[PDB]
Design an enzyme around this catalytic site. Structure first.
Site: not given
Ligand SMILES: O=C([O-])C(O)C(=O)[O-]
Ligand SMILES: [Mg+2]
Ligand SMILES: O=C([O-])C(O)C(=O)[O-]
Ligand SMILES: O=C([O-])C(O)C(=O)[O-]
Ligand SMILES: O=C([O-])C(O)C(=O)[O-]
Ligand SMILES: O=C([O-])C(O)C(=O)[O-]
Ligand SMILES: [Mg+2]
Ligand SMILES: [Mg+2]
Ligand SMILES: [Mg+2]
Ligand SMILES: [Mg+2]
Lengths: 357, 357, 357, 357, 357
Positions: C162, C164, C193, C195, C219, C245, C268, C295, C315
């Site tokens: 993944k 960002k 991602d 965010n 994401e 998450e 998460d 997550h 993850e």
């Molecule tokens: O939380 C994080 O660092 C990010 O959004 C992820 O998906 O890993």
């Molecule tokens: Mg994320």
């Protein structure tokens, strides 16, 4: 160009008039965090947070203390400050204690801004002061004390009271409401608050029984986050379901009103996101056709309700009276905004020292 | 305490820089009502209204003059004044010309309140001034003029332009957009405006072809009141449908967003209900996740967009520059709010005499 | 019968292998709260919390320390303990930091219960250990570093990475994804991602362009709480929207899935409510037909995903490796659960001293 | 690493206290299949299935016997076993008798797992034993016997009973409820069960009449699979509609709750998919805000309800008392989980031989 | 008047022409229950059931034998018999194996009623025989065998084939479909069957790629009971989703069509409830505008499809040819109903002995 120059917090556990018994537990004294926002204009903004339980009090003070780093030397521009804090806490979760802290800053920043302009907050928001009808908020008091507190309130000029219900039996809920009603007469409001204590079927059964008795609204019958459940309860009632004290930001209010959870709303000035959040909530309540009351925070709520298109009731529950001068008054059961700059909160500095934690 | 002491209006037909040709007729000069709101504090609030067609100009001035008696001696509290006007016009219909007149009063009242506090409107609303990205708004100009004006705007620092489309043939719409795109490159916004000129099926066909070309948004493809039709058009597009210049009050915005009419909004500071209505709209746009731009009224919209959580674009279309000092500036394609109290509108008093109707 | 006898917390700021740059700010070291739950059976449960920003770190530790008295002497029964905490925090708001604190207690309690029974957590949940496919989670790294890290991961046996995204220009997002794809081939996962960095229309435009490139999922394209907006974005895509998450509790997951916000979920382990909350979430994901990934919290997530009916991806983002022994291993890109009782977390006691706040 | 080493089944037709008359037919003795799951750890898991009618008894035993081939030498990991069986029966249909068989295996596998860990099942699930309120379940008994059975139950400390209704006339239903009510008083639950015997209009008419009398819930008013019909009945009632005994897997519960079929649920530990299925159901009931009771299987249901967030009532209907030692007790009308490993089922080996088929 | 006088069943495991490999396991010979229904008129009705896996074969025969006593001496009136069985099995669950057993009785009863009247079943249903287009149903055969079988079928006059897909890689699914298409041309049907092997997002990705290739339909992309998931998959496709072989009764069909799960249907003559259930299904498919094909049971399906208003395709997959005379023929790819009374099934009595279990 006016900048924030300091943030000070004080944690206190303060005495109330009467312990707030609820169907889910008792609150005796109140754990508060008192907030002072110093500025480059000299004036200092004042607000406070309610921590609910002493278990969260130190945590909440510490969070705010650490949040000082984000706001000191920023311009005193509450809407801009709020956007900044929403962005900085995007990952952590801009809810819960974090959001409550952010709202304390907002409320103190608007108090300071009113002070910069030497004008009461209600006027800075573009509205006129007017008296706002208030109900006196009581607790899970039993038949005898509930009835006594109602009589005293009526004598003082309040036209409604709220009692907390959710006794082990429905008959105990009804006995309390009946006793109050006999003491205060038919032309008097009796609000009732379940404090999230029932499941949906139990709430339908108890609420249809209370509706037959005659009550003004039924507040938080079930778990606060269960907006669908509130909708299903409201679907079985003529009397309005009231909620909103637990909404953390206008985004949560929006979700609830979008699915028809309730016919009345009562945001909490802290949880809803302070003044900034309150004004946004106000606009939602107007469009969704929802009469909007307050929850706690009577000092600032008197101002805010005067600027709220669908203003309904002010909740009188004086959590901070032991540490704030009584500049807010009640005449004829109506809250009367003081003619003071910002919110009209002046600390009782010698009393605060008695209650520090 | 601070009271309105008087209201004066002047109806003018003013010259533009370039006639505003639309698919549904063209606006060659602009009919405006200039508003002066006197107050007991000595300061005078300024605003103006746009009447669209000269046919409505005298009527709008007459209406405002007949409203003087209802606002003279009232407090300079725009929120409280708006509520009073909504109630007074409950029967007549608080919409159309009446609502527009109320909005001109609101905008001049907020200008006056900024002046009372010696502070730009943006700061009185609790936000910081910031530059706001603007697009330059052009007309149904033809391939040659449209492309010239686009280049001129790009030369001046604007990062987007809007052109008006709805020529007799789709091929003509596409020819104009292609010739602009060739002259300005891919890293440039081209917004297009249909000014309500198409039925739903025609709008789906034209819009999907424009979408292939690459445009930034498609504005008012069909009849403005037809929110369901805008939804049906949006349902067939990836590009965002933009609308909102014709919403009379936030209640009309709420109805449109509630059914998914558009993915962008652009309220008009006058039709939305002035500052009071704009701030309501901004709360709605935030909750519904809609980036919010302005429509006309560039002088006040620069302030308002700085306080709008989902602020998107300021529309540069200078209707009143012949009679208002150029205190609003553009740098690098961004509007810059002047450091003046209230809105920063100052009349060109020697020019107004030339344009009186 | 087996009772909790004590709670100890240590707040640390720990070094990572590589700062976590996001479109909304960057996480350069990780603030964690390390939790030790003592029991009457002699065994000690271990868990940790992630505070996201150092601003919330001391507050979170303080909160947990003030919660010791409510769990000491309670039975080591995580489900019953969760119900008690939900009730105790009914008023304060069982969300945000409070809920995160409850989840750290839950995770350490399930670790302790595995230890009491001398059995890995996965077997106590009624499932068999199995290897679980993992992707390596990278950051807003730029074309050069992103492509290097992808190659390194592929070399090590990972079948997906993944990255960002949310650079200032869509073209930059696309340049990074293209350069990865060139370096790893078509038979490789590239998750992206955002965010929460885009508004809905921007997310539709960026995502449809990414979809043309070929990505595995998109994401958190917009504000995490905006489930309706995620639905609107998903409605325009073939590629799956991934989120979760930021759900605080399974009740937030339920609200999102109930309106079709996403076609993938990734709770998460801390925000979802620990093991107790994760197992609830897994039931929901099963019914709604949503493949469920993790997550962060890789140590416990390997166990939990083995008991998840719609398990998708683990993850790999090793936040705590500086203070936890590397008992979790990766082979052929799959996480391998260690054969140790409970979660298999063992503290690096000599390293923790270096990082105390 | 603990493996299943044997599966044994015994078909019995066992004596009850009283024949279960229903509006759709009588059950006198009970046809059960007793299941023993031997393991490599020595301990043996015990469960049983209810076949409803002797017509299905041999078929059900034979199916389980043939299913032994899928589970012998597999690890004792009920969640993993369940996934395996769902996959192997994908084509045949993982419902009906097949699903019931799979659930018998699950229930015996969790009993064995509790035994491996020398801990009661409720503790292995992460919960504490607590007493669970039970109602005594009766039948279509006529006025005289219904009233006698209710009196005896009240004398024994039960706070509610359930009677089966759907006599040829509504007046006969009402005469039975009225007679019980007079004997037991107003502060007593009277549940009523239609056993699918009415069409929707008949159910609306009879149920509104029963609601006027005062009953606690109305169970399966119409055909069990007709979730829309149940919704239409529930739409016309204040009293809650109860169902769920016939749901085959949590997927069927999900479909029913998704459309608002009922305000109460009562899964059957066998039909819902055993322990594994029950815990999933538990999570759904929690999110949908549905109080959750049991159906039959009182031995394991006492454990399961103690781990169910919305636990409501335990159904006391002792089908297997002639062949299982009375380790489950009732004190004050509450079921009391025995302090024994796994479920606490111990066969009465000398009694079983009397009833073999 | 004409009565059932007896029921005989024989369980066989019969050889096919080619093992039925699926993505979820393979069916190498076919387990069938052969049914003989004796009547007071001298004629004997014949039907059979498919048990899918040998694990369910003995159980299904046992169940039917234990049902003899409920149908012996009942009138040979299939509709009235179905109602009786639905009521008798109300508690046990009229689904799965039980419903399948009821359907075998129904099919043999309609065969017997055709014989009583000396008329093919199609004419007894009020329709004319007509040839019905059939596709030849193949398996997960690989590129080489799949392409060979397609050519063979096209040579024989079939105008479509079905292949089973769900190989480990999408590229493999596509390679098989491309190689078939090359060998048969564009004017030929290629149906594809996923046998429930994909989750929703995987199904969307695989199906959109298959759609680009050109396939006739996509069958059972995900778990058969997940109607909402089939709807979500269909929502992303132009090609029709096909399902229905796993509906147990028309009530399951109704639930699926009510939410838009599919644009084609293919009930299974046994699972749908025999002739009685099929005729109900055909009414539903007509109203919902769904072209209706068959699943297996080719002997009876040729009759039934001739009476189906939206008849689409007959599936040729000859499970029982080793034990039933080849009276059903195919000419020009169309099934031809034999001119024999009832269904036209005649047992190969000397072959059955070879295959008894
Ligand atoms: O939380 C994080 O660092 C990010 O959004 C992820 O998906 O890993
Ligand atoms: Mg994320
Ligand atoms: O008073 C209230 O409405 C509420 O229950 C509280 O006490 O917070
Ligand atoms: O009002 C207008 O002239 C036009 O529709 C615009 O968007 O600018
Ligand atoms: O008791 C019940 O709830 C049900 O009717 C049964 O007997 O199976
Ligand atoms: O049942 C099957 O063998 C298959 O799914 C088919 O459609 O023929
Ligand atoms: Mg309350
Ligand atoms: Mg326009
Ligand atoms: Mg029942
Ligand atoms: Mg098939």
């Amino acid at each position: 160009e006016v900048l924030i120059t300091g943030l000070r917090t004080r944690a206190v556990n303060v005495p109330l008039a009467y312990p707030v018994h609820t169907a889910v537990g008792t609150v005796g004294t109140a754990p508060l965090v008192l907030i002072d926002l110093a500025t480059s204009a000299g004036v200092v903004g004042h607000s406070y947070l309610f921590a609910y339980t002493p278990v969260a009090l130190k945590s909440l003070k510490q969070l705010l203390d650490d949040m000082a780093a984000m706001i000191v030397n920023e311009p005193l521009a509450p809407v801009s400050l709020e956007a900044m804090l929403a962005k900085r806490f995007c990952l952590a979760g801009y809810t819960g204690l974090i959001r409550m802290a952010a709202a304390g800053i907002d409320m103190a920043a608007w108090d300071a801004l009113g002070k910069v302009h030497e004008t009461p907050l209600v006027k800075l928001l573009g509205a006129n002061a007017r008296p706002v009808q208030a109900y006196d908020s009581h607790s899970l008091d039993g038949v005898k004390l509930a009835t006594e507190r109602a009589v005293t309130a009526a004598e003082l000029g309040f036209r409604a009271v709220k009692t907390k219900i959710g006794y082990p039996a429905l008959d105990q809920d009804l006995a309390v409401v009946r006793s109050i009603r006999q003491a205060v007469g038919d032309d008097f409001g009796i609000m009732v608050d379940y404090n999230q204590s029932l499941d949906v079927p139990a709430a339908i059964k108890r609420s249809q029984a209370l509706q037959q008795e005659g009550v003004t609204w039924i507040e938080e019958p079930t778990l606060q986050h269960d907006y669908e459940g509130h909708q299903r309860i409201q679907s079985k009632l003529n009397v309005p379901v009231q909620m909103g004290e637990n909404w953390l930001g206008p985004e949560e209010m929006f979700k609830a009103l979008s699915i028809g959870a309730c016919r009345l709303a009562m945001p909490d000035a802290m949880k809803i996101g302070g003044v900034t959040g309150w004004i946004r909530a106000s606009a939602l309540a107007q469009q969704f056709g929802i009469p909007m009351s307050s929850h706690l925070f009577q000092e600032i709520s008197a101002h805010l309700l005067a600027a709220t298109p669908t203003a309904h009731w002010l909740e009188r529950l004086d959590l901070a009276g032991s540490v704030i001068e009584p500049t807010l008054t009640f005449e004829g059961g109506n809250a009367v905004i003081p003619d003071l700059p910002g919110v009209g909160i002046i600390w009782r500095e010698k009393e605060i020292g008695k209650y520090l934690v």
